[PDB]
Symmetry: D3
Subunit: 298 residues, 6 copies
């Protein structure tokens, strides 16, 4: 029994037909080089991801949504211990500067997309419960709030290739498992199936950056803060940004409504935690301003 199993989901390479188009539309609409694990997991269910994504799309594609993710991102620093810079440690492992930069770019890309995924998951979860995810505000978006951000990945960004956990070394599986468990999560975030090609670094990240704050009041309060930012932000959308499960009862069985309810709630927590975690990983390299900047859609 391997250390880490593969969690059930429609992996990037498994999406077919319309769901594959949805995955690509998520990548391009959100300008992110991976489809979040929440999506991938929930995409195993009929209808919901496509439907919810269709509602979210026009709302998440705007500058207003982008500003909300930026607010999330800016607010994602944990007032925790100060971390040492992993750079010298990676240099001591003989990583080149180019390799460290590849890691830093991967962190940046994750730190760009995760806050947008907190917007996404918030919109999906809140709308699932008929809570406010747009359309209720008296004033529609004005000025350039309503404008669309660019479509597609930013230049020079390619899609991530998430490592195959079953194929991964025990070391990779172990650190992904440790990171998972340190935060009482259910699986390694996509971020770690990205970063987990460098389990040497992830072990440093876990010891220096993540384990010291996992499950702490300060981390949880940061998550609370950013979840609140996301939740408030989506109320400014011009139209609802997900689908209500009570509207889905012809498309989904009771059992699927229950599972997706759980999943939506768990992922709303998970994305906020992962948003913080990877920002904190970049913060160790750089500092909070860099790690929370919007480096892609400005």
């Amino acid at each position: 029994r391997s250390v880490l199993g593969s969690f059930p989901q429609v992996d990037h390479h498994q999406a077919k037909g319309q769901l594959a188009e949805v995955y690509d539309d998520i990548h391009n609409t959100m300008r992110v080089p991976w489809v979040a694990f929440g999506i991938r997991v929930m995409s195993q269910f009929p209808h919901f991801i496509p439907d919810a994504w269709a509602a979210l799309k026009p709302n998440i594609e705007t500058r207003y949504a982008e500003d909300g993710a930026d607010l999330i991102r800016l607010n994602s620093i944990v007032p925790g211990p100060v971390m040492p810079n992993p750079t010298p440690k990676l240099l001591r492992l003989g990583w080149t500067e180019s390799k460290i930069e590849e890691l830093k770019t991967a962190l940046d890309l994750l730190n760009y997309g995760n806050p947008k995924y907190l917007i996404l998951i918030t919109a999906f979860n809140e709308a699932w419960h008929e809570r406010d995810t747009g359309g209720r505000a008296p004033q529609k978006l004005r000025g350039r709030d309503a404008e669309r951000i660019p479509y597609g990945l930013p230049n020079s960004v390619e899609k991530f290739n998430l490592l195959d956990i079953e194929k991964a070394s025990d070391r990779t599986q172990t650190v992904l498992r440790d990171i998972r468990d340190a935060f009482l999560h259910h699986g390694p975030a996509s971020d770690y199936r990205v970063l987990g090609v460098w389990p040497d670094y992830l072990e440093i990240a876990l010891r220096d950056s993540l384990a010291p704050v996992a499950l702490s009041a300060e981390y949880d309060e940061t998550a609370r803060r950013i979840r609140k930012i996301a939740r408030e932000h989506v109320k400014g959308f011009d139209k609802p940004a997900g689908v209500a499960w009570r509207d889905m009862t012809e498309k989904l069985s009771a059992e699927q409504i229950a599972g997706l309810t759980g999943l939506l709630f768990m992922y709303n927590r998970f994305i906020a935690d992962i948003t913080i975690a990877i920002i904190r990983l970049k913060q160790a390299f750089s500092g909070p301003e860099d790690a929370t900047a919007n480096k892609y859609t400005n």
Copy 2:
């Protein structure tokens, strides 16, 4: 379309056969007059609730487990604003003392059971992820810790009858909906399908006790605290207290594994929040010592 939907679940009256026996075994083993909403929802899926319960039962029937629930309960007070006693407000609504005592008894019974359900859900959720829910400790429980508590509901305690949301008044549905949404929950806890026969009280409870603290750092920090207590405590069990989803892959589909993962996580949060909420409601009548006492299994 009504204010509040019925969330999918196996309601107490719907359980049949071996699941009805599990439900009764839960009532009797935990000494609680209701089967928690998370169990009722999760019991729509095959295998899991029966199998997890079978693992949990010998753990949760011990005095050790009971002390863990006591520790949760004792630590469930939110360091929030001081609440006014609802008693005079109920007396102004013309409630008799008897009727007020009926409500206080209901709160006491929920306050007894909820922390045990936090142990339950923590055990289920952590075990599902192969995290520590027993059997790893240096030695077995002994002494007082190992003794089973009594089986069955306490003297004078009968099962609660949860109200049927579909049949409830708009006022009842509204306050259950408001209480659900005040905490960003997915449905009304069983507690409120109990207390919701008194929506005039629940409106006061929401106003006075719950709304002022819902989503607040103080509340969420209390939930973190008691979740941590429960999570630490189950490590003391003599044997694992749930099932791991990687052991359930012949019983559950990928989709059900994902749904149950979500559910377990959501309910591990939900039960903590509700434990705190109904303790807070009793605290308003009484104070923290009474609201957090173990009144039933000493």
Copy 3:
């Protein structure tokens, strides 16, 4: 020169004609044995106190207002250091039990009235700025929230006689001055012109109960908390509960508008600080439950 001046105000014995009736209606509507210092100072301006009181009266005379004052009272404990009971020191000074009880009664009366005066001053100040002090809520008060509390002082309560500061001893003056200055106030609260006939007690109270928390984050946070409570609570009034200065410009000169504006604001802070202070004094004798109880209008 004495260390303490008499601050300009219409003292209880100086009010005449309609203003005297207003003072008495304040005593009797609020069931308090003193007209608060803010009112007595603001009463030297034409119009405002009578006009603002007229607006407030029907709102402050209700159970709803009384519950708001209770919510303030209940939340007025500072999370500060634990205080010793002054009783032994007073006994050792030869105070009789009777006199200690006279002092405790005086504290209880002040602690009854002060939260209601915080509602009063908050309504006045908020309304002065056209902020919400009633009438905007969609739902009017329902049930018995709208009922009047009894008119007049509670049985066995007589009006306080505030000491004449000019005639007071140096020791009374000094401790009132010291208490004023410890909190950066402008004058001794009425409370201290009542309690300051016992300056030996006030010196103990200053040392034990007030000085250690004056100006602290804990005190000021308590004050913020009860100010907020009052400010929120007055929005529930059925009609606005003061007058707007922009509606007073035929009755008040610019200079008077400016002075009253400052006075309103200063007294909105003063009354919250004093509410906390005298509650804290009683808390040293008893404890927070007793010191924050509504002992008069239930």
Copy 4:
């Protein structure tokens, strides 16, 4: 009726004779391009502002006093949520960099002066109550502390022109009223009669920077902090830095003493709050170190 009234005051253009001299002396002694709103309101009273200012001037013109204002400035950052940079948003509204820099300069000027006005108001308020604002210390100021700062506005700085609220657009009135009420203030600070020529920016500032922290414990603790710094600081002046109201009773009536007492207290809070607000506004553009720097009198 207008959304916003003009509050009674001697506006810049209304001061005549000796009071105009005083205004100019305040501009030049403090090196600020506006006479604070507290001064302009209080200047409608005879004697007090000239008399208080005469006492304060030799104290506030010192480098010691400047250091105090620097300490206030450096300590005015609220440990609140992180704010997005308004720069992109102003660029989206088509503002040139030049115009943005004009706004940043105006914020800088406000941020320079407001801490000094907190020294001023603290001196005035504490001296009014005969509390320590100088002359009680062991040593007189000596060395660098004693040197007068430059007189006059800094190079390239011209006096601000405060917008006429009666002539302002509804948009400007609305945002000034919103900012006023967000902090439970009595009128728009001078700062907003300066910045309110850009109501598009002030709407951003209110949503991004001010509203999220208004009335919060963090803001109010910041204010407590800087009020304290100022209050401690002025004890180091060589002689009292204001006038006591007990010494003013031939110059001011009882009513005016009461009005000024309120106004002083209200402005001592107002000016701290506005100090923090406009520093926070600059912080959103440029960070806490830039926002809290002394850029003018070094």
Copy 5:
């Protein structure tokens, strides 16, 4: 090698001659049934303990000192997690009510003495460094404050018999060692050489009451708070309450002065930590009011 060593000290039974008189004088002046471990350790050095006690005695025997120890005691509760009552566990282990009361009496005795020992050690340590421990205050103590408390142990109290650690069971050594190391202390407090005859209880106390808070911010802040209370309090003594090491250089060697400096500082911390610990143990039995009461010298 045993689990626990006996730390060097002049144990109660080893003190001879004038040092035995000093020990008895400490018992009788402080009204405590043990000479604290700090004194016993420091009493191995010549002169210091007799001299410093001579200075302290007239100061600590006063009601003013007693009131200081009461403020410490009252402020020694840690705002930690809520503890279960150990009573049921002890009952289930077959302790009798009488044996439980014997333990509760022991805790009460300890909780009476330890605050006074924090006065003692504070006075010693601060006086060692020529810091203020009396004689600098404006007034001599007058009145109640100056009165000596009674001399001798309270009615019904006899001296404790501290267990001989070398003769103790491994179980007692172990729990003493664990309690010592949980708080990074150097040895078991006298309290645990009292309570360690019930190592069953101390194991419960360690798991339930002490480990959860040891080395925590809350515990350390409690200790800071009470250390501060003692340190402020001894400044009100009429004359210095220890000896300065610079006045002991004919009595002590450099090495002894260094050693005693370290011991005094260590015990200043130790006694505050133990004060809190044993109060917290009694709190688990009863509650903070009982655990912090002065039950012996009123």
Copy 6:
């Protein structure tokens, strides 16, 4: 009598023979230009310093140890008030830029070495109590953690010359005494026998930097944090990094064991406090990134 005494210790110039070798080995192993005051004082006892240093040396000379001290250093900022930069005061006093840089360099040297001395004293103290200082971690250091940092003082660094306190001016004695007593220390840290040649600066530092945070919760929590960092970090050492007193009983007398136990505990606190203090002094010149950088051994 002078203001400040010289505390008993083997000063740098006093160490002879093997102890002088140990002092030089400390300098060179830790790359610090002074032997800490704790070492100097404890070196007056036989055996302990040489023995404990022998155990610590191979552990403290590693990159792992250095990363520990870096973690300490980076976490040493107190979340206290923002400080003004002393530079303008020093320039105004006629300090030259060169001199200010000599000061800044001294601070940087101290800030490099103090965190390492906290590792040192922590190892010594915890080992003295048989607590974990190495050799118990399942995994030995790997990679370059085990590698030696360079031996010797960093290029361009010479030993500090600590001032002779007996020969110092009253001004230097006074500021050293004030700084010692502000923190309730026993003597001036080596840092102030270095910096105290500039008492003008230390007076500014005490006023601007140290006094406002001494004894505060924020300071002491920072110290608790860094002490915990150090204490956890030494457990990662490959073998124990000091000597247990129970292994020293042939080499030290009971009185020396007691004194050293006290001194070790006291210095484990002292070094933490001094670490934070000098970092805070450099932070006033620069900011937290600079003041907590490792400028010497990277």
